[PDB]
Design a binder for this molecule. Structure first.
Ligand SMILES: CCCCCCCCCCOc1cccc(COc2ccc([N+](=O)[O-])cc2C(=O)O)c1
Ligand SMILES: CCCCCCCCCCOc1cccc(COc2ccc([N+](=O)[O-])cc2C(=O)O)c1
Lengths: 356, 351
């Protein structure tokens, strides 16, 4: 916890030390270390660190045993690797969804010294640094290969979830005619596709976009390192928590205080959100047409229309009801684990998800 | 053969995605999109890098069964998939217009930058899934994936340097400035061969020559000192290859398949050579006219390259560098690899 955060500099500098070993002119070496030290600091720090903490807690409580400082070094490494993964995903996402603020400060890709060209390159750098760190600290552990496979697999699922989140209402999904490889015009205005507006599609997307890397990955890391039918049960719980987490994120996107969430766009970006689905199943026929006419447009007035509907239909109150039922369903599954230590960590995680 | 196996590796990967827990209609959308991502971006190149793996593997040792060819062709196609990820990324970063004689992936209305960014990570990560599928039981498995990782890290740093060598941060990053854009200008302190070699070795040499050669050797069962010699040769080849690329950028997209170094404010060999040859007044002209999206400005640079006989200086560099590379190749003391590298040297610009 306090320990996990004191260790950040070590992992950052181990990776920067690897870059420093390249055959480059000294002046070039100093520019590189200065740029990359900021890349990490700006993007890795400031989060709730829920995912990193989950690794440290699971590694410890999987089994009450003596754990020495050499072993902790390896666990804190994996913990920071997941925070670095979060960093890469968030820089990418802000490029993709045209973010403005993240963790209460300008998105990385907006800085004029960075711009989109550097941010894209930086995403791949952060992403690859994970595997370099894992090699530096865990290369001789027997779980080595499984740990990197787990990071790889979760990332692949996250990428598919992000593809779906980005394209679920797009022409190529609506008119499922092939992609015109000769068309480089602006696409026409994005619009919602009512046939995709259901919870089954939504779960598909969010489980892949969120559940695998935010819950399954950290728990599986903690367990693999600690040293089997159970991984299946933990996977089911992760799916439930990822959906719970993402729906709360959707709620914050439109009902949250940007000064508290640290970020400013779902409606503008034409996303399939929980508030959208909930409204669509409850609202009148004229209001469905109003949603189709107004959703996914940049115009602030179009957005207010959607926002007013969410108020008209008391979506804030529907969320509260969903939150209570989902938490119960999650605790329910956690109790069917039959593993005291892991159950204990997951219950604490559940209490602390939204604050950290 | 290598040509013929493409569909299998592609389909092996798409098949992994197809095993996901997703509704059937969703699976078919995903299948359709990603089949095009691979097809559109992996095919149409000269395949120099993939072919190098195949040749090295074959000449390193023996009779080769199809089981073995399956592993070697996997690595070859993984390097072409890496090339695909890099080209999509590079075209986003440098605002490319054409690549391999067709529109850049990121420019398509159905894709755009937001998808292109996600697709770069998809292609890059599919490499490690493919290597798992075909090589997870080989003793060289861990070394192979570390070679891909490390070559990629060097390429990212090289691409970082190519992108920023002339920027004002290379002459503290302002984390409060999202409003005042920086105008592209050249920095004369960076216009030299030393700096250029740093950039070019990291940006090209490692993934284009070292990585493919090391894959073949590793898979073939070669720690050994030859790896160091291979690294040195690769650096010379990467430099030879990039300089040739720079030359073609000024001196027919029909043949290159792509359009812009001057207007893009790129550090190039022609820029450096002209700069070491020209008078003071022409240095001022270059500074005033380079890196500008402007027909008149670009023609001034074009004329200076003609004036200072850059074509002739290139012909001359080409001759000297090929000699240095062949001289390095002969110090290998491994007939098979020496042959492949000679063969590569003849085929570089044609494929
Ligand atoms: C590479 C291509 C692969 C896909 C590219 C992006 C993938 C999108 C999935 C991750 O997107 C992100 C990113 C960040 C946050 C969140 C969620 O809420 C948070 C959770 C934790 C932290 N943290 O405690 O700060 C903050 C937030 C926050 O509300 O900011 C979701
Ligand atoms: C952020 C990701 C990490 C780094 C960011 C991108 C890295 C950029 C480095 C590679 O950029 C590229 C890309 C592609 C090609 C070339 C070179 O010439 C080629 C060589 C071989 C084939 N091939 O036969 O097509 C074609 C070409 C071609 O002239 O098209 C250079």
């Amino acid at each position: 916890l306090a320990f996990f955060r004191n260790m950040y500099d070590k992992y950052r500098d181990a990776f920067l030390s690897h870059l420093n070993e390249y055959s480059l002119e000294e002046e070039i070496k100093e520019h590189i270390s200065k740029y990359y030290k900021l890349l990490f600091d700006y993007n890795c720090l400031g989060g709730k660190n829920n995912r990193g903490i989950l690794v440290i807690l699971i590694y410890e409580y999987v089994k009450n045993r003596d754990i020495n400082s050499s072993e902790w070094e390896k666990a804190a490494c994996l913990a920071w690797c997941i925070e670095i993964l979060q960093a890469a995903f968030l820089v990418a996402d802000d490029i993709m969804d045209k973010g403005e603020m993240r963790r209460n400060k300008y998105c990385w890709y907006l800085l004029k010294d960075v711009e989109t060209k550097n941010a894209v390159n930086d995403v791949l750098l952060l992403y690859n640094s994970i595997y370099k760190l894992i090699e530096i600290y865990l290369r001789n552990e027997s779980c080595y290969v499984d740990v990197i496979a787990t990071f790889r697999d979760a990332t692949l699922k996250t990428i598919i979830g992000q593809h779906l989140d980005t394209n679920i209402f797009s022409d190529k999904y609506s008119d499922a005619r092939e992609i015109d490889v000769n068309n480089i015009n602006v696409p026409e205005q994005p619009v919602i596709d009512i046939n995709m507006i259901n919870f089954g599609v939504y779960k598909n997307i969010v489980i892949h976009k969120t559940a695998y890397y935010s819950f399954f990955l950290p728990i599986v890391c903690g367990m693999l390192l600690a040293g089997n039918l159970i991984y299946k049960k933990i996977e089911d719980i992760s799916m439930l928590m990822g959906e719970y987490f993402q729906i709360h994120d959707d709620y914050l996107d439109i009902f949250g205080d940007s000064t508290k969430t640290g970020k400013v766009s779902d409606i503008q970006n034409n996303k399939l959100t929980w508030p959208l689905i909930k409204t669509f199943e409850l609202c009148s026929e004229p209001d469905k047409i109003k949603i189709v006419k107004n959703y996914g447009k940049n115009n602030l007035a179009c957005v207010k229309v959607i926002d007013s509907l969410y108020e008209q239909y008391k979506i804030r109150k529907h969320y509260e009801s969903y939150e209570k039922a989902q938490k119960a369903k999650i605790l329910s599954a956690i109790n069917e684990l039959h593993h005291e230590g892991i159950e204990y960590v997951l219950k604490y995680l559940l209490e602390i998800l939204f604050t950290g």
